[PDB]
Design an enzyme around this catalytic site. Structure first.
Site, short mmCIF file in Angstrom:
data_model
loop_
_atom_site.label_atom_id
_atom_site.label_comp_id
_atom_site.label_asym_id
_atom_site.label_seq_id
_atom_site.Cartn_x
_atom_site.Cartn_y
_atom_site.Cartn_z
N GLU A 1 0.88 -1.44 -0.34
CA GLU A 1 0.07 0.44 0.09
C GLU A 1 1.05 0.99 -0.01
O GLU A 1 1.91 1.33 0.32
CB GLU A 1 -0.83 0.13 0.78
CG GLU A 1 0.02 -0.20 2.09
CD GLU A 1 0.64 1.15 2.92
OE1 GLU A 1 -0.39 2.26 2.42
OE2 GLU A 1 1.55 1.60 3.55
N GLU B 1 -0.60 9.74 4.42
CA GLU B 1 -2.30 9.62 6.39
C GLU B 1 -2.18 11.77 5.27
O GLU B 1 -1.42 11.97 4.64
CB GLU B 1 -0.89 10.16 7.56
CG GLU B 1 -1.53 9.21 8.00
CD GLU B 1 -1.00 8.92 9.47
OE1 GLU B 1 -1.48 10.13 10.68
OE2 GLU B 1 -0.25 8.56 10.43
N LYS C 1 7.97 -1.89 -1.89
CA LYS C 1 7.50 -0.81 -0.88
C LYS C 1 8.63 -0.13 -0.64
O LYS C 1 8.64 0.49 0.10
CB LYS C 1 6.38 -1.35 -0.09
CG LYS C 1 6.27 -1.11 0.95
CD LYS C 1 4.76 0.43 0.22
CE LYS C 1 4.62 1.10 2.07
NZ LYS C 1 4.32 2.34 1.95
N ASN D 1 9.33 3.87 0.01
CA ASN D 1 10.01 4.51 0.73
C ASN D 1 11.09 5.11 1.38
O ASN D 1 11.24 6.32 1.71
CB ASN D 1 9.17 3.87 1.96
CG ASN D 1 7.58 3.90 2.26
OD1 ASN D 1 6.78 4.54 1.48
ND2 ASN D 1 7.03 3.45 3.24
N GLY E 1 14.50 20.23 6.20
CA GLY E 1 14.25 21.09 7.32
C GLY E 1 14.78 19.97 8.41
O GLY E 1 15.70 19.07 8.27
N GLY F 1 9.31 12.09 9.80
CA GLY F 1 9.18 11.39 11.56
C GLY F 1 7.93 10.58 10.57
O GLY F 1 7.24 10.13 9.95
N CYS G 1 6.29 5.54 9.79
CA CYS G 1 6.56 4.87 8.48
C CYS G 1 8.49 4.96 7.90
O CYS G 1 9.37 4.01 8.45
CB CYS G 1 5.95 4.80 7.31
SG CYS G 1 4.14 3.92 7.81
N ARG H 1 3.73 9.60 15.82
CA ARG H 1 4.16 9.02 16.01
C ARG H 1 6.00 9.92 15.14
O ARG H 1 5.30 10.15 14.14
CB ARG H 1 4.17 8.19 15.38
CG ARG H 1 2.97 7.20 16.40
CD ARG H 1 2.51 6.08 15.41
NE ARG H 1 1.21 6.60 14.68
CZ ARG H 1 0.67 5.71 13.48
NH1 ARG H 1 0.44 4.54 13.78
NH2 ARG H 1 -0.35 5.96 12.00
O1 UPG Z 1 9.89 17.55 1.84
C1 UPG Z 1 9.76 16.63 2.57
C2 UPG Z 1 8.02 15.95 2.14
C3 UPG Z 1 7.86 15.52 3.19
N1 UPG Z 1 8.83 15.26 4.82
C4 UPG Z 1 8.43 14.48 5.81
O2 UPG Z 1 7.99 13.54 5.90
C5 UPG Z 1 7.87 12.82 6.60
C6 UPG Z 1 6.65 12.26 5.73
O3 UPG Z 1 5.86 12.20 5.07
P1 UPG Z 1 4.72 11.58 4.06
O4 UPG Z 1 5.10 10.79 3.01
O5 UPG Z 1 3.16 12.75 4.55
O6 UPG Z 1 3.73 10.41 5.40
P2 UPG Z 1 3.66 9.32 5.61
O7 UPG Z 1 1.63 9.41 5.85
O8 UPG Z 1 4.02 8.61 6.11
O9 UPG Z 1 3.60 8.82 4.02
C7 UPG Z 1 4.55 7.63 3.76
O10 UPG Z 1 4.42 6.10 4.36
C8 UPG Z 1 3.31 5.65 3.93
C9 UPG Z 1 3.55 4.02 4.71
O11 UPG Z 1 4.26 3.64 3.95
C10 UPG Z 1 3.50 5.59 2.42
O12 UPG Z 1 2.13 4.87 2.05
C11 UPG Z 1 3.78 6.91 1.48
O13 UPG Z 1 3.65 6.95 -0.52
C12 UPG Z 1 4.97 7.69 2.21
O14 UPG Z 1 4.71 8.69 2.05
C13 UPG Z 1 6.65 13.80 7.42
O15 UPG Z 1 7.26 14.08 8.52
C14 UPG Z 1 7.31 14.43 6.53
O16 UPG Z 1 7.00 16.43 7.24
C15 UPG Z 1 9.91 16.72 4.47
O17 UPG Z 1 10.43 16.42 6.09
N2 UPG Z 1 10.11 16.75 3.89
#
Ligand code: UPG
Ligand code: UPG
Lengths: 432, 432
Positions: free
Chosen positions: A163, A167, A216, A220, A265, A269, A272, A339
């Site tokens: 998947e 979020e 997967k 990630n 930045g 976090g 995942c 988390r």
């Molecule tokens: O340019 C960026 C983009 C994201 N983040 C940080 O990265 C973390 C993860 O962000 P995001 O990818 O939106 O969150 P998830 O919901 O953890 O989604 C990831 O993890 C899911 C669980 O596996 C996968 O399905 C998704 O494709 C993958 O985006 C967060 O802390 C963001 O603030 C950054 O620091 N810089």
């Protein structure tokens, strides 16, 4: 337009109702399938039956009410009964880090044994689908074995169907995925899932179960790598007095490079990326591989929040007794999930240095209190938080943060908020 | 359609006529500018005046003949005269690695001093544009200083305008770039280059000279990083018995990830990526930064050719006295350039292990002989090479290689050739 005659309604179960499980359960019901869900936590099931999401996800409460109204979604009293009442079960339980950082597969193993018991009671073929993020080999190894050990000799098939939901946009990513990956253990598995997803307009790639599992982690970890690369480049840009976001605007126009996920930045976090990256490293090391890039990815990530606190400490001349705020505790905007939150991590580092810490988040403060308790002051109004502290670290770019008054403040910006430059001292965590 | 009235024809010079310099000189003339080129090597100038490219680049001989026919392209007898006859000079000389791996800036410094002498003779404002890949700070530091030290007090402006041309498609990338980056030292520089590029339909980003210099390293190192990441993932896929190219087909469908440059294999060669990555690491280390990801990128790259030779050695049971071929010596298909070629590196490793080495390339064998001399046998027919050796390593995927007969051979495939799977023993360098 119209549905062709004989267009089969599948009967699907989902075990594990975190955001992945509950979005699939609701989404499959809205696609036209009969779905039976189950989770280990009876209060989750009770809430979901009542139409009340236990987690915050944009549009979920309305999708859930629609799926329940259709009559197509229900919830079982046990994992085994969900399984026995359907023809394929999506396992979507967690795979948290084990103590040594490898993937903890106990939740998946228990769900697979439940599946095996439901199959044994059903007495006929069933498909076991692993949505959980699991190391390659888990689907045809551990899960097929644990299922067979309980199935009493009933035949079944397995498939990895990873998947890719994020979020905050999970329903949209469910209905409009960039691609669907089906790692089928045999032809009957592949044809069954291609049927399940027939109404979803997206490329469907059928491949070996091991290949799908590796897709997967490769996806990630590569996203985490873009973020850490932007941070590595950003430390350098910052020394040069340059704006790292403007650099990656130009880098991303190359047709070979995705323009997204170069947001330098405080790092990533959430539940995942940190733990999947660590699982990937531990899995490769278990096969004798060095995993040098993936380890570098995590080294940079672990450094960023320490660096942000070091900048604040240098600008204020030491933190003991000093009044310092953290803006943002959710791990990203528009969730209440803390988390592996960098904001929480920064609060802890500040605490460990004798700062009096104030925090704000528009949604996550209750969840963060679950973690930080009374060790910080929780401030309801983010402006009021700025007015009370000497220094502040911006840890999640909530849109309401862009409009605040940072004048006269010392700000270490961990997320790139343009308005914060008005501060008395502006330090970008990974840019000038 | 039609050219607006008063549409200025710029007078531009180019110093350094490697593939970047000669493609810009020809391209600017074909865009409608008056161009004067110069190179330190008089035989290059003599050949170019005769319409005979000294280097192989698809479509260059015809673009050059067209630029010469227009009357708009000429070549000077000295750098200073090229400069004095124009209003802006593109410096495009090499920046090879220095002995400690940092960028060698002596060629750029000499060209900037020549520019300063031409400006002094011209007596009026001039623009100095750095196309050379140079560390951030070089344009407004070293180059502005070296120019001022010779210019006798004549005012001038500087700009970084990095280049993103790929060998093999440089003319197309010149006329249809993904983006144009202008790091202008002042407004007059920015407006002059936006004029020069007015007929090119592409996004133009004006930024500080340091930001433009950093964009170039961030872009080239990020591409190298995708390749090394694909190789890191590939070592793992190979242990799992999985096809890494099918994995990255699925990874690349994500809308955040560019689908290109995940071509796992022997790694990157050529005169840019290895030395720019090393320069980037050395530049960051000179400012006290660890550069952990960029170093990992290079660690994986340096490993791949050793690994390919280790696979061959394991499959043949030792290499001493054994007859082994290398298919491909050019650093990529469709050039005759062998600089930093992985094929050459593999030939050397084989030699160092007592193998009798045969090599083939459809274009680069003369250039490779310049490097390997009589230490290998050069084979004109690649099939004939296969028929003569026990084992072979495929190091450049020339299209003619896809049609060869690999049956009965031991093949270590460094570039993914699907036909080679017919071999008696097929080892992918970074896949199963
Ligand atoms: O340019 C960026 C983009 C994201 N983040 C940080 O990265 C973390 C993860 O962000 P995001 O990818 O939106 O969150 P998830 O919901 O953890 O989604 C990831 O993890 C899911 C669980 O596996 C996968 O399905 C998704 O494709 C993958 O985006 C967060 O802390 C963001 O603030 C950054 O620091 N810089
Ligand atoms: O998926 C891939 C793609 C490339 N390569 C290898 O990488 C090396 C570099 O290839 P390429 O990028 O075509 O060659 P260059 O002509 O060296 O072009 C690079 O270097 C130029 C000089 O800075 C930049 O302008 C270009 O954007 C950047 O592609 C070659 O050995 C390729 O065989 C791989 O191993 N896998």
């Amino acid at each position: 337009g119209l549905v062709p005659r004989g267009s089969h309604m599948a009967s699907l179960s989902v075990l594990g109702l975190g955001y992945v499980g509950v979005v699939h359960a609701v989404g499959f019901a809205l696609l036209g399938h009969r779905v039976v869900g189950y989770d280990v936590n009876p209060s989750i099931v009770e809430r979901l039956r009542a139409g009340r999401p236990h987690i915050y996800e944009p549009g979920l409460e309305e999708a859930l009410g629609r799926a329940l109204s259709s009559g197509r979604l229900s919830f079982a009293e046990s994992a085994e009964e969900a399984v026995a009442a359907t023809d394929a079960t999506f396992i979507a339980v967690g795979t948290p880090p084990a103590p040594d950082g490898s993937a903890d597969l106990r939740y998946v193993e228990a769900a697979a044994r439940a599946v095996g018991r439901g199959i044994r009671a059903k007495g006929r073929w069933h498909l076991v689908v692993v949505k959980s993020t699991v190391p390659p080999g888990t689907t045809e190894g551990l899960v097929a074995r644990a299922v067979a050990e309980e199935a009493g000799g009933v035949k079944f098939s397995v498939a990895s169907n990873p998947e890719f939901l994020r979020e905050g946009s999970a329903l949209e990513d469910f209905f409009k995925p960039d691609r669907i990956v089906i790692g089928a253990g045999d032809e009957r598995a592949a044809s069954f899932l291609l049927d399940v997803y027939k109404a979803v307009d997206a490329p469907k790639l059928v491949m070996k179960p091991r290949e799908a599992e590796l897709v997967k982690y490769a996806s990630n970890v590569f996203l985490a790598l873009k973020i850490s690369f932007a941070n590595e480049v950003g430390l350098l840009a910052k020394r040069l007095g340059v704006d790292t976001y403007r650099v990656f605007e130009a880098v991303g126009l190359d047709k070979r490079i995705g323009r997204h996920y170069f947001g330098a930045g405080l790092g990533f976090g959430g539940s995942c990326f940190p733990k999947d990256t660590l699982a990937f490293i531990r899995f490769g090391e278990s096969l004798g591989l060095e995993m040098a890039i993936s380890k570098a990815v995590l080294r940079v990530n672990e450094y960023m929040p320490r660096y942000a606190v070091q900048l604040l400490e240098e600008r204020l001349g030491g933190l003991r007794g000093r009044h310092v705020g953290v803006l943002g505790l959710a791990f990203k905007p528009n969730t209440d999930d803390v988390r592996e939150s960098r904001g929480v991590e920064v609060a802890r580092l500040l605490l460990e240095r004798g700062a009096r810490v104030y925090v704000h988040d528009p949604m996550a403060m209750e969840k963060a209190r679950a973690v930080l308790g009374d060790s910080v002051t929780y401030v309801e109004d983010p402006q009021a938080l700025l007015d009370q502290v000497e220094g502040v670290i911006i840890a999640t770019a909530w849109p309401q943060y862009e409009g605040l008054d940072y004048r006269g403040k010392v700000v270490v910006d961990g997320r790139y908020v343009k308005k914060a430059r008005e501060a008395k001292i502006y330090e970008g965590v990974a840019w000038a």
